[PDB]
């Protein structure tokens, strides 16, 4: 896992001079794809979430995050009326800071045990990036990076 | 590391997943990625009979300490024991 | 840090939870305390746009290592990546 190092205003990907005084400065920052040249509209984005099965979901902790202009809340329904998105586990709630909430719904043909991201990103949630979509809680698609802060 | 066990098995067919190069090719994305059981690297040691069942004797020796440690702690899944080992190691070496 | 990303946003409006600014007044006791959303300190980074684009690119580059690490690991909720990085650093320097 590459690690970022800063001199004054430049980022260096992991020098003996490169020092880290205490663990408090190690910071994990999660950045949304809103500014990553990714269309944030509902139907353009909906294509990126696809349903798979037989792969365990994984969760990572990121300390800080970016504001989200467009964040999605999913309550997808199977054609028979059942809901297919897995139940939100404890300790996971919605993305904290979002301007506009997309209550996207009604995608009938979901045919998998879980929903993963077709581009490789994570769903940020509340300081808990996940590789899977949990039902009923808002999120934003983005990436998680790890950094050592300057002293 | 002398084995008092009745049987010493020189063959050690080992599967593991820490290699991080288990999914060379295919994909790394979780969507297009492999199955949950296809992420395993397989091999065999063929180093020494004394080393393999030496490991087996070591596992007998350490099962008692592992059971005591698991009985002491209250966490159900203790995923972090190698971190404990590294901290103890380097802290007794260069601590203080 | 060369952006292969098609478009870098030159600034970010971020929020943190480790900073103490969320409850300078108010109170620490949870009984008289903020909600789950009041644990957040805001921040803004108009300056250092090149840093932000490079950090975007770092996020892009480190994704697949994170996916491989997660796929190998059995622990579902991994909160020990930073601790493991501290171990790797200080072990690499002062290990032997």
């Amino acid at each position, epitope marked *: 896992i590459p690690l970022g190092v800063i001199h004054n205003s430049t980022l260096q990907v992991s020098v003996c001079r490169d020092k880290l005084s205490s663990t408090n400065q190690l910071r994990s920052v999660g950045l949304n794809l809103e500014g990553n040249g990714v269309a944030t509209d509902v139907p353009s984005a909906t294509k990126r979430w696809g349903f798979r099965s037989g792969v365990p979901p994984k969760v990572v902790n990121y300390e800080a995050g970016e504001w989200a202009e467009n964040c999605y809340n999913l309550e997808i329904k199977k054609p028979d009326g059942s809901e297919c998105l897995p139940a939100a586990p404890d300790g996971i709630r919605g993305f904290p800071r979002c301007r506009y909430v997309h209550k996207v719904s009604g995608t009938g043909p979901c045919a998998g045990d879980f929903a993963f991201h077709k581009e490789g990103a994570f769903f940020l949630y509340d300081r808990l990036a996940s590789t899977v979509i949990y039902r009923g809680t808002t999120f934003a698609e983005g990436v998680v990076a790890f950094l050592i802060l300057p002293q | 590391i002398v084995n008092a066990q009745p049987k010493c098995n020189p063959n050690l067919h080992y599967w593991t997943t820490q290699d*991080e190069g288990a999914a*060379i*090719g*295919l*994909a790394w994305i979780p*969507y*297009f990625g492999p199955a949950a059981e296809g992420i395993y690297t397989e091999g065999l040691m063929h180093n020494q009979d004394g080393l393999i069942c030496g490991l087996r004797q070591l596992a007998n020796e350490t099962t008692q300490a592992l059971q005591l440690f698991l009985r002491a702690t209250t966490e159900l899944r203790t995923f972090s024991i190698l971190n404990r080992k590294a901290i103890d190691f380097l802290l007794q070496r260069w601590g203080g | 840090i060369v952006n292969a990303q098609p478009k870098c946003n030159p600034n970010l409006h971020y929020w943190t939870t480790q900073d103490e600014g969320a409850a300078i007044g108010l109170a620490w006791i949870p009984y008289f305390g903020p909600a789950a959303e009041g644990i957040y300190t805001e921040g803004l980074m108009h300056n250092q746009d090149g840093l932000i684009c490079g950090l975007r690119q770092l996020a892009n*580059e480190t994704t697949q290592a994170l996916q491989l690490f997660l796929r190998a690991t059995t622990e579902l909720r991994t909160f020990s990546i930073l601790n493991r990085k501290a171990i790797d650093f200080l072990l690499q320097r002062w290990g032997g």
Partner: single-chain antibody
Amino acid sequence: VQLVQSGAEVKKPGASVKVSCRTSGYTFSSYNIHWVRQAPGQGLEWMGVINPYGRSTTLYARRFRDRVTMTRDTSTSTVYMELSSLRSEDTAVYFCGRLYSGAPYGLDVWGQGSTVTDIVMTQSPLSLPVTPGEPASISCRSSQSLLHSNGYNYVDWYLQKPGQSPQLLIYLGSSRASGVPDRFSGSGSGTDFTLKISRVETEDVGIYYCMQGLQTPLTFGGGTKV
């Protein structure tokens, strides 16, 4: 997106061959580099795969394992393979391949280099006389089902123009690549697949190859003429 392979690499029996392959116009670290072989014979053989990322994990086929090595240039942005125990049967044309590590979205562009000293898959015609202004169809079948849990089909088709480096036609079942005209559509489900040229134009002729990515060692089909 430009890639070039090394020069005319003619050797002698038992000599060592060090062939290089440059990367330009794209991120070196992300995309994997597969290397393949085309003998004088119509068959294609997948030589190996190298992942430039990080510590450069590599995988080699069970056919030519531990006889050959691959190595990445972090700064030069060039991957090179050296093969030592050379023999007459190894005389062939080696090719590069840029495969996305993220997903088997097909091989974007290949190189070309010369050298002179399991999922079994098959194709139906192996040769097919053609007439202009006509549709055509080629079938490809595999031993194991290629319906990955995603619902997609890890099946690819490439064309090789007469005496030319191969080109990417169809990836992931029925999603054609950019730059391929609409005449080239491929269908299929599970074990069996087919590529149906809606109308084989007089321009587009050559050899056609069927590829799988579900399980390494990656394998190639026989090939069909058009």
